[PDB]
């Protein structure tokens, strides 16, 4: 594949371990030397891990890598806050004749108890209306982890087009925040009825609907 | 000590050419690596797009193999990208990166990054939206800023005597034009008698916007 899987998160606690997967098809990460790097969103990639298992300069012993020939993984013992990242695997893939990345992993280093989004869902408003145009705003906040999934409904059916969400960023108080829209014609707002935003952060959702008629 | 720098336009138009050239310092090009580039969308993973070594091989992704041209010349520590027929999908992070020849493959240093906007849009003010609830202890107002260009935008809020917690949310970038929102929480209960605005301050189209949130 063009892009290697990787779980989307991982989290645990300072002292704890965590191990990220990177897999390929069948076994052809045995052919390719798996790297791997971390990034904090805000900045550039560094390499941690090369060769599957070797280590840079600066990088501590914490940090470990393996190569199953299907699967690559990087174990990282002894978590401290500044590991905190999101973490990309890559290898050349040699059916592809290109050099492919995973698909990416946040790694949250527990600081702060769980805490479930706090959802608000807009309608448009008259003003936007007037210009033949619809938005909806989902806004999203105090979550913690950082990580949400976002899918809409309209008159109880999965939207699949018009909807983008943006990344989380951090709270003042290191929760996290986020707001999702789904773009609509006037007219597709004024031929629906019911619209709902359902927010998916630790495996429970929490959703907020509305109806036009009100 | 080896440092990598991109530089070039952080606005593109679609159809021309996007250009960046990445300055090394502190490392010998002629060395047995690779000089590349790699690009990341907001909120997205990581593309690798082609390198280059000092004897002329050059790799290219080979999904945009025929737009893109990479090249060096140590003489003046430069690794360059040209990528032709610029789209809306071309918007991203832009990294240089040393990379390690033969079966290695692995990437470092990388530049810190350069912002590449692919639009064709004009300096255009958002249209500001007030956002009301539709008809528990507190209420969440505020205001979407749509179709703007360039970045950036500011919003305050004035909320009178209420004490309040506002969140502003990171624009995205749809079709060459921004959209961000902002929100502000007061208590259940004070608005709509007690007043609430936003002010969303464009400074690149000289524009502000004071629009008070009217229930529904």
């Known amino acids: 594949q063009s892009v290697w899987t990787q779980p989307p998160s991982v989290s645990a606690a300072p002292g704890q371990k965590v191990t990220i997967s990177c897999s390929g098809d069948?076994?052809?990460?045995?052919?390719?030397?798996v790297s791997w790097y971390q990034q904090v969103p805000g900045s550039a990639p560094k390499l941690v891990i090369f060769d599957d298992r070797q280590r840079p300069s600066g990088i501590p012993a914490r940090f470990s890598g393996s190569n199953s020939g299907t699967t690559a993984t990087l174990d990282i013992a002894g978590l401290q806050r500044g590991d905190e990242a999101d973490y990309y695997c890559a290898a050349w893939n040699g059916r592809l004749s290109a050099f492919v990345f995973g698909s990416g992993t946040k790694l949250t280093v527990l600081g702060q108890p769980k805490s479930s989004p706090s959802v608000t869902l807009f309608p448009p408003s008259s003003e936007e209306l007037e210009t033949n145009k619809a938005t909806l705003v989902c806004t999203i906040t105090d979550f913690y982890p950082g990580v949400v999934t976002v899918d809409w409904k309209v008159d109880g059916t999965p939207v699949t087009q018009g909807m983008e969400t943006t990344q989380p960023s951090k709270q003042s108080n290191n929760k996290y925040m986020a707001s999702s829209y789904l773009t609509l014609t006037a007219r597709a707002w004024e031929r629906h009825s019911s619209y709902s935003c359902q927010v998916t952060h630790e495996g429970h959702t929490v959703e907020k609907s509305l109806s036009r008629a009100d | 000590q080896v440092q990598l720098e991109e530089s070039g336009p952080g606005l593109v138009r679609p159809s021309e050419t996007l250009s960046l050239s990445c300055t090394v310092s502190?490392?010998?090009?002629?060395?047995?690596?690779?000089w590349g580039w790699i690009r990341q969308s907001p909120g997205k993973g990581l593309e690798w797009l082609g390198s280059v070594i000092h004897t002329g091989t050059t790799y290219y992704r080979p999904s945009l193999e025929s737009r893109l041209t990479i090249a060096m010349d140590p003489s003046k520590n430069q690794v360059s990208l040209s990528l032709t027929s610029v789209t809306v999908a071309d918007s991203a992070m832009y990294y240089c990166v040393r990379i390690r020849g033969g079966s290695s493959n692995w990437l470092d240093p990388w530049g810190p990054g350069i912002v590449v906007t692919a639009s064709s849009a004009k300096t255009t003010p958002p249209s500001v939206y007030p956002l009301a609830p539709g008809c528990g202890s507190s209420v969440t107002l505020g205001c979407l800023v749509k179709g703007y260009f360039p970045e950036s935008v500011t919003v305050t809020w004035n909320s009178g005597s209420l004490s309040s917690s506002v969140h502003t949310f990171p624009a995205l970038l749809q079709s060459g034009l921004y959209t961000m929102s902002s929100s502000v929480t007061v208590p259940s209960s004070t608005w709509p008698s007690q007043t609430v605005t936003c002010s969303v301050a464009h400074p690149a189209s000289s524009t502000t916007v004071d629009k008070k949130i009217e229930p529904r």
């Open positions: 502190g490392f010998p090009m002629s060395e047995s690596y690779f």
């Open positions: 069948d076994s052809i990460l045995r052919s390719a030397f």
